[PDB]
Design a protein around this ligand. Structure first.
Ligand SMILES: Nc1nc2c(ncn2[C@@H]2O[C@H](COP(=O)(O)OP(=O)(O)OP(=O)(O)O)[C@@H](O)[C@H]2O)c(=O)[nH]1
Ligand SMILES: [Mg+2]
Ligand code: NA
Lengths: 17, 210, 996, 129
């Protein structure tokens, strides 16, 4: 679950505000 | 101007001593190897935050047959650049020799060791091998007269040691408002002619990035 | 005008006119200075100029004139000295000794004219090299005798003895014969008892700092060669480590002396020497702590401020501590009472390591590597250095460098990987808490987050898998939080790059966690659409970087996935790469190629290959249909871009797939070679219409790119090809007909050097299977390329280089192609090889000598047949004399070894009677004459004419020795180097060649 | 109270900035020589409304181009480049005193070179006024 919650945060990574 | 220092540039023939200086004087890149006969003195000014600094650059001859006065050129030099070629192992083997003759005339001066031609893909004198500077207290810089990699560095370092300020930086020289020169009929002929030859002589190194 | 008077040697030299010319040079400028320079040079090079030297040295008041007088004398002494009459030799010795003594007596001149004094000493030292000790046996006793009287003379005699030691022991190898080096070395070694006696007395009785520095400066040079007993069995270690570390004028030189002491040859099993080696180190550190700075001093701030000679001193300190501790730290690790000394010296190195100076940092990092390696392997050591190592972790992390600065990065990573193993818990802590200080903003900057990322990625695969997992998740969570926190897409891009940098460095984690790997790759595909500077490159770099490491996880079907992910990448390949530049697309395609190579089912790999090449094959086919039916469309520059990108895309895939690329190559091969011909026609047509300037135009350079990328694709494939039957049967014959005639029949400026490069790879891989094709290659490119490059050494640099590679590999692989050359054409082959000898360009020089050497081996391998017999009668003495010419002209020193090897091989053939024919022609020598005798006779004559100042004895001796030594290579080289010294001077000793 | 612890481009606005390499034609030889590489700026003076080219070299920051974008100058193409312009300059003061040059200036791509020619002509339309 710790790896999966991290994977989900990674999904939303963006360069824009 | 009044604050000026004599610099001696020494090292094997072909290493790019003159090319390096010409790049600093005019901005150009000399492709041809035309050996220096003895020495050529070239005045070279930099603008710094502590006023302007000038180097009298004695560009000396690396080949032995064109060597001229040899260590006669080193007398009362206040700093030096020892140059070699990272593509040619023998130029780095001769660095101890160039240093020997230099320090015997110039006992106590700031010296930079420069490994030129690092732009070349097949490098022969590896970074790992370059250690001669350590015990002799020389500053070392990988440079390239072609790519301008670290080309400012040797002069910046020497400037700092000679003036005695480690925070000395180079700065933008003052840009005066240029003139509004209207052109006359009497120069229109030779400008017309010179432009015809220019357009129809291709620019060097079109594969380069800029 | 008046300045060219001194060149008129028919009159007495006007000394005031010399000083004008000398002043004008050293103090003038512009035209004035440059005219004076050429006249000083013509004066100095005048062979008679030395006669007017004692004239200058007594009459002139200018030191610069006197310096040039000594420079002219110095030239005579090293080169024409034994040619002089014996009264001149004594006369010159007398006024060099007399001038030196004269200048030392006068305190004004002794102080102010250091440059002229030191040059006089060096000029004296050249005389000693000629005359001492055989013709000056009482030099050393009379030197030591004068040193008691005048302190100035004593100090100057230390400078002389320093320079003497240098020229005998440090700089003799190049500049003297082996026999003369040994003579001077034994002669110095025999009288050193008396010299050390003087130095040690001067160092104890120590009245004068300039004298003491001069003595310590000489000592430094003695330490390169003297036996350890002079250091250990006298009191001199106590003096160096205590007395001379206190005073700052002596400190610098003393530390360099102790640095060299630490490298002395020492018996490794004697407990008094071990206590004595501990003692001097203990003292030296004690003086630093109380006289210079304590262990807690911020040396980063000191060095940066650059006062006095502090930077040189701190450099010397690093050198001293590293040198000693590398050799001797074992002596301090077992005693309890030496533990503080051990750790204090290491703490100084920790503080030295914080200094902002790349080259210094490198020096200390070599030591840190040495240590942590030893702590990783050696039992029971690491616990001693737990506190030193913990600080080092911070020092290395805070100074981490980008991977692109290859070498400094490698050393850092190595050290950091050892320190991570030694204590994983501490490393993780230090890295995480540094991350928290990026989040809180105290240490926040673009540079600082980048260095931490490079540091975190450097220790990959060192932690346990289970610890790594927790560490990476924590690091990635925090970096994601940092991106979301930050504002302005400059800041966001720096962190996104670092996030993606770090995940790229942990493939083991990506391998274990498919879900996460998939997210990272899809995120990179979103980043391939960002216009912001650097982002698309970073996305493509990271993609192929992940792909290289985790290849298997793309090519197989994962759990809960309908297909292997390679298929999913290929389907949206148009959409994914739509906003990328052409070179970035090629990297994408190259990456896709790596993955496809892992599929070992042939049907599937070929299917994936054709799927991957879909867009470029559909673009290709429509261009072929267009431009074959009407070649008018090939003039458009936009079509030329599209075609070059298709070929470049093929090169990129072929690079990563190699032998697996064949089915794609087969799809385009024949149409591609037809395109090559069509493009060639346009280039030749444009050249006739526009002139040689056409080759510079964007129009023609575009077309030439097409040809070059076609040549590059084929070269790339054949270099890696596994099925050589199909290379010969299908690829070769079409390729040769397409490229060879076009090359030959273009003007030199339109010839692509890549044609040569391509052919080299063909001859390399399959030359042995195509003897008729290799003959075709020579006929088409040999003579016409040789004519481009045989006028000068500069023009057509790439062609020149690739030309000798091709001849090299032909001479190795299909030597029979040279046999079928007409005799006239085979003569040009020999001419071309020797032409390569004379190049300064190392690429050409090395192959020139290599070809020459292999040719000789190939002719030898034929044995007693008429081609090999005719080859020796025609070309043996050409290679011998052409090799000798480059060995002895002082402009091809870089090629010495392979020159020597080639020369030995040529000589060994005659010594072993391997040439089965008279090298001499009809009636030139008596009938019953061996090649050995005629070889000695030919060379004796050759050298006599090339070097007329050598005696017949010098030459006959040299050759007798050289031919004896033609089985032992390094000895042979020794004899050659002796000959290179002797040709630079007159009256060299012929017995020097018996040195064995 | 506690006492505390005790270029000449100011008057100008940046209209266009592009990265470029500048050459001068040495008429005596038959060759171009590099003069500098860096940011080439178009600078409108707030007093006179006069636009000039200012181009400095990287790192040393020495001036390698300093002249008015005069209405009379015309940008010609070079034979060996699709991303370059060449033109006569009657007075440049990058070295010190005014002096005539045949300049050529090459950009990263054709698209930049085209935008240069557009902005260059816009500058000339200001200097006629
Ligand atoms: N690739 C590359 N070539 C260089 C560089 N610097 C110089 N060269 C080449 O070196 C050749 C000769 O350089 P010079 O400056 O004449 O060398 P030098 O040391 O002045 O020669 P001497 O005057 O004989 O001492 C030229 O053809 C240059 O093209 C460099 O940074 N990179
Ligand atoms: Mg030169
Ligand atoms: Na890394």
């Amino acid at each position: 679950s710790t790896v999966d919650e991290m994977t989900k945060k990674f999904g939303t990574l963006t360069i824009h505000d | 101007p009044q604050v000026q220092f004599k610099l001696v540039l020494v090292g094997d023939g072909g290493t790019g001593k003159t090319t390096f200086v010409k790049r600093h004087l005019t901005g150009e890149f000399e492709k041809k190897y035309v050996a220096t006969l003895g020495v050529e003195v070239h005045p070279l000014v930099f603008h710094t935050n502590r006023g302007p600094i000038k180097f009298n650059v004695w560009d000396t001859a690396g080949q032995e047959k064109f060597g001229g006065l040899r260590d006669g050129y080193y007398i009362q030099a206040q700093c030096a650049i020892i140059m070699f070629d990272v593509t040619s192992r023998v130029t780095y083997k001769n660095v101890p020799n160039w240093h020997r003759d230099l320090v015997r005339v110039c006992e106590n001066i700031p010296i930079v060791l420069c490994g030129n031609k690092v732009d070349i893909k097949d490098r022969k004198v590896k970074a790992k091998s370059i250690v001669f500077h350590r015990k002799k207290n020389l500053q070392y810089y990988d440079i390239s007269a072609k790519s301008n990699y670290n080309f400012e560095k040797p002069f910046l370092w020497l400037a700092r040691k000679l003036i005695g300020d480690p925070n000395l930086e180079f700065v933008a020289m003052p840009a005066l408002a240029p003139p509004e020169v209207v052109m006359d009929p009497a120069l229109a002929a030779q400008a017309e002619h010179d432009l015809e030859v220019a357009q129809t002589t291709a620019l060097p190194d079109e594969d380069d990035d800029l | 005008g008046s300045m060219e008077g001194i060149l008129d040697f028919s009159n007495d030299l006007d000394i005031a006119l010399l000083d004008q010319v000398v002043s004008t040079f050293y103090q003038g400028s512009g035209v004035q200075q440059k005219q004076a320079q050429e006249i000083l040079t013509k004066f100095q090079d005048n062979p008679d100029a030395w006669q007017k030297a004692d004239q200058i040295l007594q009459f002139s008041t200018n030191p610069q004139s006197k310096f040039i007088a000594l420079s002219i004398l110095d030239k005579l002494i090293t080169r024409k000295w034994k040619l002089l009459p014996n009264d001149h030799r004594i006369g010159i010795r007398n006024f060099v000794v007399g001038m030196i003594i004269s200048m030392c007596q006068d305190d004004e001149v002794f102080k102010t004219q250091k440059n002229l004094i030191n040059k006089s000493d060096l000029t004296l030292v050249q005389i000693l090299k000629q005359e001492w000790p055989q013709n000056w046996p009482e030099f050393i006793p009379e030197l030591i005798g004068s040193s008691s009287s005048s302190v100035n003379v004593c100090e100057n005699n230390m400078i002389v003895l320093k320079l003497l030691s240098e020229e005998v022991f440090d700089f003799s190898a190049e500049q003297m014969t082996q026999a003369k080096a040994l003579h001077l070395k034994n002669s110095m070694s025999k009288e050193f008892e008396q010299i050390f006696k003087l130095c040690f007395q001067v160092l104890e009785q120590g009245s004068s700092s300039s004298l003491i520095v001069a003595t310590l400066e000489s000592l430094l040079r003695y330490l390169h060669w003297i036996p350890y007993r002079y250091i250990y069995e006298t009191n001199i270690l106590e003096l160096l480590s205590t007395k001379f570390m206190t005073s700052p004028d002596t400190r610098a030189i003393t530390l360099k002396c102790l640095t060299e002491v630490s490298n002395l040859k020492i018996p490794q099993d004697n407990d008094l020497i071990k206590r004595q080696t501990v003692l001097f180190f203990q003292n030296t550190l004690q003086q630093i702590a109380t006289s210079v700075m304590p262990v807690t001093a911020d040396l980063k701030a000191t060095y940066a401020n650059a006062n006095g000679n502090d930077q040189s001193f701190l450099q010397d300190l690093a050198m001293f501590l590293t040198t000693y501790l590398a050799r001797n730290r074992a002596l301090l690790e077992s005693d309890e009472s030496l533990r503080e000394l051990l750790l204090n010296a290491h703490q100084y190195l920790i503080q030295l390591s914080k200094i902002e100076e790349r080259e210094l940092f490198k020096t200390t990092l070599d030591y840190w590597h040495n240590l942590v390696a030893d702590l990783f392997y050696e039992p029971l050591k690491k616990h001693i250095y737990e506190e030193i190592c913990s600080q080092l972790r911070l020092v290395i992390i805070e100074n981490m460098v980008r991977p692109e600065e290859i070498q400094l990065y490698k050393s850092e990573r190595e050290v950091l990987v050892y320190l991570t193993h030694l204590n994983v818990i501490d490393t993780e802590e230090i890295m995480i808490s540094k991350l928290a200080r990026q989040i809180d903003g105290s240490e926040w900057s673009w540079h600082n987050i980048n260095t931490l990322s490079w540091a975190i990625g450097s220790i990959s695969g060192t932690m346990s898998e289970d610890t790594e997992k927790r560490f990476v998740v924590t690091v990635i969570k925090d970096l994601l939080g940092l991106c979301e926190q930050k504002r302005g897409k400059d800041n966001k891009a720096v962190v996104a790059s670092d996030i993606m940098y770090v995940v790229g460095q942990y493939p083991r984690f990506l391998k274990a966690h498919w879900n996460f790997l998939r997210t990272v790759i899809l995120k990179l595909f979103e980043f391939m659409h960002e216009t912001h500077e650097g982002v698309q490159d970073m996305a493509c770099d990271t993609f192929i970087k992940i792909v290289q490491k985790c290849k298997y996880h793309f090519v197989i079907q994962q759990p809960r996935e309908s297909e292997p992910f390679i298929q999913t990448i290929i389907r949206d390949i148009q959409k994914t790469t739509a906003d990328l530049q052409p070179q970035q697309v090629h990297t994408f395609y190259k990456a896709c190629g790596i993955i496809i190579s892992e599929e070992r089912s042939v049907a599937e790999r070929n299917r994936l290959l054709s799927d991957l090449m879909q867009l470029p094959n559909m673009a290709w086919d429509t261009i072929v249909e267009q431009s074959t039916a009407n070649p008018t469309l090939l003039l458009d520059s936009e079509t030329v871009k599209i075609i070059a990108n298709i070929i470049k895309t093929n090169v990129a895939v072929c690079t990563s797939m190699g032998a697996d690329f064949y089915p794609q190559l087969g799809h385009i091969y024949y149409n591609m070679l037809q395109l090559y011909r069509a493009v060639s026609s346009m280039i030749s047509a444009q050249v006739a219409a526009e002139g040689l300037i056409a080759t510079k135009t964007p129009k023609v350079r575009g077309l030439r790119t097409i040809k070059k990328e076609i040549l590059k694709l084929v070269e790339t494939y054949i270099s890696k090809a596994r099925n050589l039957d199909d290379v010969v049967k299908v690829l070769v014959e079409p390729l040769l007909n397409a490229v060879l005639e076009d090359y030959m029949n273009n003007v030199p400026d339109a010839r692509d050097a890549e044609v040569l490069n391509c052919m080299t790879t063909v001859v390399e891989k399959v030359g042995h299977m195509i003897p008729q094709g290799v003959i075709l290659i020579l006929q088409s490119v040999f003579e016409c390329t040789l004519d481009m490059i045989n006028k000068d050494f500069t023009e057509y640099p790439e062609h020149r280089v690739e030309f000798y590679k091709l001849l090299k590999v032909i001479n190795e692989k299909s030597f029979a192609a040279f046999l079928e050359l007409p005799p006239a054409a085979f003569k040009l082959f020999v001419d071309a090889i020797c032409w390569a000898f004379k190049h300064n360009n190392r690429d050409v020089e090395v192959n020139g000598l290599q070809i020459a050497l292999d040719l000789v081996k190939n002719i030898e391998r034929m044995g007693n047949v008429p081609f090999a017999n005719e080859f020796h009668k025609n070309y043996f003495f050409i290679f011998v004399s052409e090799t000798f010419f480059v060995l002895t002209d002082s402009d091809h020193k870089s090629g010495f070894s392979k020159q020597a090897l080639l020369l030995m091989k040529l000589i060994s053939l005659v010594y072993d009677n391997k040439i089965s024919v008279p090298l001499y022609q009809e009636a030139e020598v008596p009938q019953g004459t061996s090649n050995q005798v005629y070889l000695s006779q030919y060379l004796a004559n050759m050298l006599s004419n090339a070097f007329p100042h050598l005696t017949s004895e010098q030459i006959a001796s040299f050759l007798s020795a050289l031919t004896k030594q033609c089985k032992d290579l390094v000895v042979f080289k020794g004899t050659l180097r002796d000959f290179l010294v002797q040709i630079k001077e007159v009256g060299g000793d012929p017995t020097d060649y018996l040195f064995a | 109270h506690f006492e505390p612890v005790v270029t000449m481009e100011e008057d100008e606005e940046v209209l266009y900035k592009v990265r470029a390499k500048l050459f001068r034609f040495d008429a005596d030889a038959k060759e171009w020589k590099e003069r500098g590489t860096g940011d080439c700026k178009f600078l409108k003076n707030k007093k006179t409304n006069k636009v000039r080219i200012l181009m400095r070299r990287d790192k040393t920051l020495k001036i390698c181009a300093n002249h008015i974008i005069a209405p009379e100058y015309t940008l010609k193409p070079n034979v060996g480049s699709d991303r370059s312009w060449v033109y006569a300059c009657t007075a440049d003061i990058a070295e010190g005193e005014a002096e005539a040059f045949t300049f050529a200036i090459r950009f990263g791509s054709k698209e930049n070179a085209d935008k240069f020619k557009e902005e260059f002509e816009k500058a000339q339309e200001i200097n006629k006024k």
